[PDB]
């Protein structure tokens, strides 16, 4: 896979880059999961129930 | 048998047309494992650390 | 200091030196053990042995000529030494053996007595010459199923099953004209020799070319010849080096000089300007070691060989040595490079200019067969002095850093750790 040799060129990924990528992942991954989860449960959430309420 | 006659490894050896083929795959795997672990460790540490923050029942607005 | 070479029908190469008492003449063929097969392996060595047979040797001794032959990987050579005056009688003996007696040397009484001698010869090697035995197996595993893997002396099994016809078949395919170079060293002039050669005509198998093959390739691997009865451990480890006629041919040789060679019993050796020695002398990790940059036509090997009685610390020997090599990519100093230049010149000089013309012939012959010429000793020094720290680093970062290795060893090697442990040391952790 030449896609690897463009970014890291035959060398292993260094801890600094690993740590940095981890912070990014944490945020991205969380939003992706929360989104899917809330969508999959559309109609049941409190957000949805509050929309059909007015007091 | 003569020790200079190296046994057959053809079934294991890759037809080297792409020299750094196994290396790129190994390093990607090693790198991805290192990434998901660090994120996992971070999340585990925060979970434990946050258990020590003010509990839901003690945040009374007097 | 002059490298003269001309072609008329055959390519003649010479290098004169008037101060030399003797003169050496010989033919060097562009084919060696690297041209053999796994099954006729040892044919070249066999040829060398009959050429030096009691019969052929006595004929030259009466005439006052001395015989010498050398079987290598990329080439092969047959040399006759004589006084500066008998420079003509050497050519008579050369032609008389390669055309006239190309059937008298191969008698069913001479061949058998010779085969019995190379058998006891190659057997003795495998039974006792552990350092060379290990170095030979290093080539064997490093270049497996490729030309450079075949050992020069051949294997006992391919040797004992060899016949007169195999010699002939090889001779009629490689001892050709287009795969040859006549060399002369000593004191004789170029014009002096070429005349005696261009005099006697006859082509003999002209236009014929040797068979082709597949390109040599390095394969990271190992062969472990454990033998707990031997009193030491002998190991050789290397990475893919440089082929002759490579831009980094000299950078590689310099790099090997940085770590150089060592002998724990020689007081002076323990004092060399080599950082690795601070680590290995504390617990005496080895009796000796020596680095090398072996170069051949298609490839080469860069690494080291070592011998040790400290069988429970072999891992420290390997570990300290590999940590030092890591340095070449990241922190080798100006003074280490400069020390290497000076010592490389001294050793390169002592090789190219010894008091022996037979060595000169082999060096000259081998060079002209590959690049069509010979780089003058003074030309080398210019290249050597031009090497910078930046060069060594660029080289190491390509050849040594996180690269596969090849390992071979014999004796008490239980302490030599697994491949991956050694391979992991070809680099260092960094942020």
| Complete DSSP assignment for B3-57 | TTSPPP-TTTS---SSTTHHHHHHHHHHHHHHHHHHHHHHHHHHHHHHTTS--GG
| Residue contact B25–A1, C-beta within 8 A | yes
B27 part of contact set with chain A, CB < 8 Å: yes
Domains detected in chain C:
1-202 (3.30.830.10), 209-431 (3.30.830.10)
The answer to whether A33 faces chain B, any CB pair under 8 Å, is: no
Resolution, rounded to a tenth of an Å?
2.3
Domains of chain A as residue ranges with CATH: 1-55 (1.20.5.260)
Q: CA C202 to CA B45: how far, in whole Å?
A: 89
What is the distance between the alpha carbons of residues C13 and C190, in angstroms, rounded to a whole number? 8
Task: Give the Cα separation of A31 and A22 in Å (integer).
Answer: 14
Number of domains in chain B: 1
Report the candidate in C423, A16, C405, C403 with the shortest Cα–Cα distance to residue B31: A16
Determine which helix (DSSP H) or strand (DSSP E) holds C135, and give its type and residue range: helix C130-142
Domain around B15? 1-55
Distance of CA C300 to the CA centre of its chain: 10
Residue B60, in any domain of the structure: no
DSSP state at residue C164: H
With contact defined as beta carbons under 8 Å apart, do C358 and C82 qualify? Answer: no
Q: Would you call A54 an interface residue with chain B, using a CB distance cutoff of 8 Å?
A: no
Mutation pick from C45, C123, C144 vs chain B, by most beta carbons of B within 10 Å, is C144
What is the rounded CA–CA span in Å between residue C138 and residue C154? 15
Residue C2: CA count within 13 A, CB half-sphere: 12
């Amino acid at each position: 896979s030449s896609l690897y040799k463009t970014f890291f060129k035959r060398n292993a990924v260094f801890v600094g880059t690993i740590f940095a990528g981890a912070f990014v992942f944490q945020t991205v991954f969380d939003t992706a999961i929360t989104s899917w989860y809330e969508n999959h449960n559309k109609g049941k959430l409190w957000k949805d129930v509050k929309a059909r309420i007015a007091a | 048998k003569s020790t200079y006659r190296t046994p057959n490894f053809d079934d294991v050896l890759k037809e080297n047309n792409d020299a750094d083929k196994g290396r790129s795959y190994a390093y990607f795997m090693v790198g991805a494992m290192g990434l998901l672990s660090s994120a996992g460790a971070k999340s585990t540490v925060e979970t434990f650390i946050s258990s020590m923050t003010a509990t839901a029942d003690v945040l009374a607005m007097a | 200091a002059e490298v003269t070479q001309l072609s008329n029908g055959i390519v003649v190469a010479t290098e004169h030196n008037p101060s030399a008492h003797t003169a050496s003449v010989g033919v060097v063929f562009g084919s060696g053990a690297a041209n053999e097969n796994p099954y006729n392996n040892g044919v070249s060595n066999l040829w060398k042995n009959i050429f030096l047979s009691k019969e052929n040797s006595a004929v030259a001794a009466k005439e006052g000529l001395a015989l010498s032959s050398n079987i290598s990987r990329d080439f092969q050579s047959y040399i006759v030494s004589s006084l500066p005056g008998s420079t003509d009688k050497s050519l008579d003996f050369l032609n008389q053996s390669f055309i006239q007696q190309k059937a008298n040397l191969l008698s069913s009484s001479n061949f058998e007595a010779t085969k019995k001698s190379v058998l006891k010869q190659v057997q003795d090697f495998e039974d006792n010459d552990h350092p060379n035995r290990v170095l030979e197996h290093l080539h064997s595993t490093a270049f497996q199923n490729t030309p450079l893997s075949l050992p020069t002396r051949g294997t006992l099994e391919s040797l004992e099953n060899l016949v007169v016809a195999d010699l002939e078949s090889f001779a009629n395919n490689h001892f050709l004209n287009s795969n040859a170079v006549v060399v002369g060293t000593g004191n004789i002039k170029h014009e002096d020799l070429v005349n005696s050669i261009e005099s006697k005509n006859l082509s003999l198998q002209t236009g014929t070319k040797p068979v082709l093959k597949k390109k040599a390739a390095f394969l990271g691997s190992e062969v472990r010849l454990r033998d707990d009865t031997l009193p030491k451990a002998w190991i050789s480890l290397a990475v893919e080096g440089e082929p002759v006629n490579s831009p980094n041919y000299f950078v590689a040789k310099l790099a090997a000089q940085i770590f150089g060679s060592y002998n724990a019993f020689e007081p002076a050796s323990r004092l060399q300007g080599i950082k690795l020695l601070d680590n290995i002398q504390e617990y005496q990790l080895c009796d000796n070691f020596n680095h090398f940059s072996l170069s051949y036509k298609d490839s080469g090997l860069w690494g080291f060989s070592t011998a040790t009685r400290n069988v429970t610390m072999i891992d420290d020997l390997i570990h300290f040595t590999l940590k030092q090599w890591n340095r070449l990519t990241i922190s080798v100093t100006d003074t280490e490079v400069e020390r290497a230049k000076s010592l490389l010149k001294l050793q390169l000089g002592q090789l190219y200019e010894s008091g022996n013309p037979v060595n000169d012939a082999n060096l000259l012959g081998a060079e002209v067969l590959i690049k069509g010429s010979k780089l003058s000793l003074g030309e080398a020094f210019k290249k050597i002095d031009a090497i910078t720290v930046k060069d060594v680093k660029a080289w190491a970062g390509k050849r040594l850093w996180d690269q596969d290795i090849a390992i071979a060893g014999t004796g008490q090697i239980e302490g030599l750790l697994d491949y991956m442990r050694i391979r992991s040391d070809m680099s260092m952790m960094r942020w």
